[PDB]
Design a binder for this molecule. Structure first.
Ligand SMILES: [Cl-]
Ligand SMILES: [Cl-]
Length: 162
């Protein structure tokens, strides 16, 4: 198991524009297009992201290409962020993947705000961090995915994904 496989399970794959859990226009493997309520605006963002007149449909390779860019972006975002970098650096390989998952979902800013949880993780207080992580909108809105990520941090294994 690795970050790509992990996120592919969490986000799924859709080749046609769809609305995510929040009602936002998305495509491929969790690639957010726009938060705007306009389908056309999303089709325009899509064409701009792909480099062609897509007409709201993309191929598998194209979806995969957006995914590679998005994962790379998340990692680089973490490394550039003063609040995240130190945590990331303190973690083992598996938990690093859990941190990347959250950033991919909520954006670096979003995650940077789980101040207390971040400190617990850095301290290696696994059980406490899992408890703190659960008291959040994130957990309440996407409980199954959140549970998978939290188990990952708590155990340091890929058990929730097997
Ligand atoms: Cl893009
Ligand atoms: Cl869920």
């Amino acid at each position: 198991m690795n970050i790509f496989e992990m996120l592919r399970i969490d986000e799924g794959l859709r080749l046609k524009i769809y609305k995510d859990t929040e009602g936002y226009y998305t495509i491929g493997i969790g690639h957010l297009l726009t938060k705007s309520p306009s389908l056309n605006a999303s089709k325009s963002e899509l064409d701009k992201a792909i480099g062609r007149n897509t007409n709201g449909v993309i191929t598998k390779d194209e979806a995969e290409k957006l995914f590679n860019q998005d994962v790379d972006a998340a990692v680089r975002g973490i490394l550039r962020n003063a609040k995240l970098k130190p945590v990331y650096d303190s973690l083992d390989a598996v938990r690093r993947a859990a941190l990347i998952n959250m950033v991919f979902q909520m954006g670096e800013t979003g995650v940077a705000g789980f101040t207390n949880s971040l400190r617990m993780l850095q301290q290696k207080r696994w059980d406490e961090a899992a408890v703190n992580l659960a008291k959040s909108r994130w957990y309440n809105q996407t409980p199954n995915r959140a549970k998978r990520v939290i188990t990952t941090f708590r155990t340091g294994t890929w058990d929730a994904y097997k």
